[PDB]
Design a protein around this ligand. Structure first.
Ligand code: HEM
Ligand code: HEM
Ligand code: HEM
Ligand code: HEM
Lengths: 141, 146, 141, 146
């Protein structure tokens, strides 16, 4: 469960992200593919080289959906319902890979927010990311 | 790798009583019912809409048979799993695009099936030796991923 | 989420366990200790020999909690509140270890209930145990 | 223990710039804050209730010092991590009773702290070499568990 301080930390960190959302979603994906090569098996139809526009474009879509979850932080299962259905019944990503992207997302945030990534906020963001992960894998079985 | 002489003999004696086609059918079917996201590779296999259609699917039973025959022969090369499964490892990654996490999931369904099949002869120590082997094979198949 | 059919299947399998709940709980533990030896690190204060009274005692307590959970499947968080408090602030078992116990739990039931452990009951039991792990670790942070 | 020339170089040059005592103190402190159940080994460290109390606790900083230092010596023996860490592996199992999964958690926290500290020179490829290394050292520390 996210506390009031957790919600305030996530909305403040993500407010700072702002208009870089998309760019940071793409860097997070690149970090993931290079650190954990088994995650490339869900993307055989994509150019995964450095600089790829398909990665960029997927970047933004992942980014936009986080923004929408942050804006609906008290009502997530409803805002991400369409998303939950697409991963469970179509893409079918093993739930294990959601922790790997969450880690990489955190690393990306750390590298670009030297001031806002305190111990407290790191904790809140990890909790926020695991909650999105749970919601996204809710309908799998 | 690295079982004791006791561990190898236990794995081999049990394996001598197994019907490889029947168990292969049961294990792969339960993989598809219990963890339904593993069905993602298999839309061309037909009806998978309920547990009974899955377990009854003939395409599912032949995949099971192919997969368990390969496992079965790997049991003879306990000393060199990595060399034995090198080419299959390369194939699953470059061509089939199979997440290696699915090998872990089949290994645990396999161990549940052996217990259901053999009841009390699937003692804790026999289970322990089989846990090491299914992780060893999962590790050998993921080895050439890149 | 547990559907209506999962709850009917768990209450059916668990009723069949009936009176051996205690003994199967002890066997599940011994299987865990032998197959996944890192889980012994939480029990340095125990005599872990085959059939020790401490191992038998703990098996019965684990069994009883599961029975309580099947009885109150519609309200697990409220029914396991005390236990989930204990694991989050006192025992503090890493959450990965709940999947090893659930696995061994599964294997114990397979070996002792040849008639009832069909593919649908296996799926319902694994979801159920996942749900119980989720309620026990929910207050961790 | 297998790194490419590019990976070894990336690892060694960045570690040349790390102040061990400082990175150690921060990485271990964030471990206790972000995954509070790791606080079960450290009841004797005193006040660990809020983030601030964890981050300026002197015993927390001294432990991080100790650990990262030993971590740093292993970076000199990258071709034989299991033989370098065998004695500490035994100690962690037989006398400290530490769940080896704790080693993976610290590995991910350490990577977050390097990114936070070095910013944009911690690029994706450098992260990937560090991810290999921390996985190696955690596997080396768990080697002698039984
Ligand atoms: C926080 C976690 C995640 C979020 C918010 C997320 C969000 C999304 C979104 C918004 C889309 C586009 C759907 C559309 O077109 O309407 C998508 C597609 C996709 N996701 Fe996820 N996703 C997440 C995790 C993952 C993970 C861990 C993987 C696998 C490693 C993954 C694999 C995919 C794939 C393969 C697609 C389809 C891509 C395409 O061909 O266009 N997702 N996801
Ligand atoms: C013990 C683990 C496994 C072993 C030893 C194994 C071995 C094999 C073998 C021998 C084949 C046929 C190779 C050929 O065509 O020459 C194969 C094919 C295949 N495997 Fe695996 N496999 C295992 C696990 C899995 C799992 C868990 C999945 C997916 C959930 C998977 C997905 C596939 C697919 C999709 C094919 C292609 C079949 C076809 O094209 O008809 N494998 N595997
Ligand atoms: C199905 C999941 C689990 C359930 C239902 C469960 C339930 C219980 C119960 C009912 C107690 C005793 C409460 C008391 O006497 O006050 C307990 C204590 C304990 N549990 Fe859990 N537990 C689970 C998983 C685990 C796991 C995975 C571990 C570690 C590998 C673990 C370690 C412990 C320990 C060390 C104790 C205290 C032992 C003692 O001093 O008697 N539990 N648990
Ligand atoms: C990179 C991985 C690690 C390395 C290289 C490492 C190394 C060390 C070293 C060199 C010591 C000093 C012991 C002595 O004086 O003989 C130690 C002690 C200790 N370590 Fe580890 N450690 C690691 C991770 C961890 C983690 C993740 C935990 C728990 C979450 C842990 C728990 C302990 C404890 C409880 C002690 C005893 C400290 C005391 O006296 O309070 N270690 N470790």
């Amino acid at each position: 469960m996210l506390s009031p301080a957790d919600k305030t930390n996530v909305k403040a960190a993500w407010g700072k992200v702002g208009a870089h959302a998309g760019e940071y979603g793409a860097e997070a994906l690149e970090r993931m593919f290079l650190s954990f090569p088994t995650t490339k098996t869900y993307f055989p139809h994509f150019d995964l080289s450095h600089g790829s526009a398909q990665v960029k474009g997927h970047g933004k879509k992942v980014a936009d959906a986080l923004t929408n979850a942050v804006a609906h932080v008290d009502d997530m299962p409803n805002a991400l319902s369409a998303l939950s259905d697409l991963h469970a019944h179509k893409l079918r990503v093993d739930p294990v890979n959601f922790k790997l992207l969450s880690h990489c997302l955190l690393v990306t945030l750390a590298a670009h927010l030297p001031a806002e990534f305190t111990p407290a906020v790191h904790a809140s963001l990890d909790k926020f990311l695991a909650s999105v992960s749970t919601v996204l894998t809710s309908k799998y079985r | 790798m690295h079982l004791t002489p006791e561990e190898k003999s236990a794995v081999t004696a049990l394996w001598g009583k197994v019907n490889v086609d029947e168990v292969g059918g049961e294990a792969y079917g339960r993989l598809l019912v219990v963890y339904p996201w593993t069905q993602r590779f298999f839309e061309s296999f037909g009806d998978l809409s309920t547990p009974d259609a899955v377990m009854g699917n003939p395409k599912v039973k032949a995949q099971g048979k192919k997969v368990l025959g390969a496992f079965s022969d790997g049991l003879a090369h306990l000393d060199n799993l990595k060399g034995t499964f090198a080419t299959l490892s390369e194939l699953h990654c470059d061509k089939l695009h199979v997440d290696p996490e699915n090998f872990r999931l089949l290994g645990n369904v396999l161990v549940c099936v052996l217990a259901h099949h053999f009841g009390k002869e699937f003692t804790p120590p026999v289970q322990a030796a089989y846990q090491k082997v299914v992780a060893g094979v999962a590790n050998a198949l993921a080895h050439k991923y890149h």
